[PDB]
Design a protein around this ligand. Sequence first.
Ligand SMILES: [Cl-]
Ligand SMILES: [Cl-]
Ligand SMILES: [Cl-]
Ligand SMILES: [Cl-]
Ligand SMILES: [Cl-]
Ligand code: NA
Length: 129
Amino acid sequence: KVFGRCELAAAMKRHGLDNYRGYSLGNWVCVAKFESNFNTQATNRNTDGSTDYGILQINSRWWCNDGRTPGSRNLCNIPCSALLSSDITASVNCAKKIVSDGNGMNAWVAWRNRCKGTDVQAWIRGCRL
Ligand SMILES: [Cl-]
Ligand SMILES: [Cl-]
Ligand SMILES: [Cl-]
Ligand SMILES: [Cl-]
Ligand SMILES: [Cl-]
Ligand code: NA
């Protein structure tokens, strides 16, 4: 599923991401845009052989099980395929654990390089929220 911008903002708010660990909603919409173009089915292979899954591009090196990332962890206790669902619940719940792991949203390289220090509120402007 490719979400619309305000459709994604609404789902992220309903699932409790607005101000989660101090990160306003626009930060989460911004990172989703640059990670996946709002596409729940997005996947990308990393150089080490791990893979990033779903709208928030969550990495199998640490967070989910895909059966083909030797030595990795599954800290969110989910199959990576659950992160590709049209419903974002699993991605949101796992993002809450990632952002709580000490580095905040710097866990997403794209957030640090493309969202951090910008006007992230623009990503939720106009949305009925
Ligand atoms: Cl957009
Ligand atoms: Cl915001
Ligand atoms: Cl594995
Ligand atoms: Cl959803
Ligand atoms: Cl933080
Ligand atoms: Na894993």
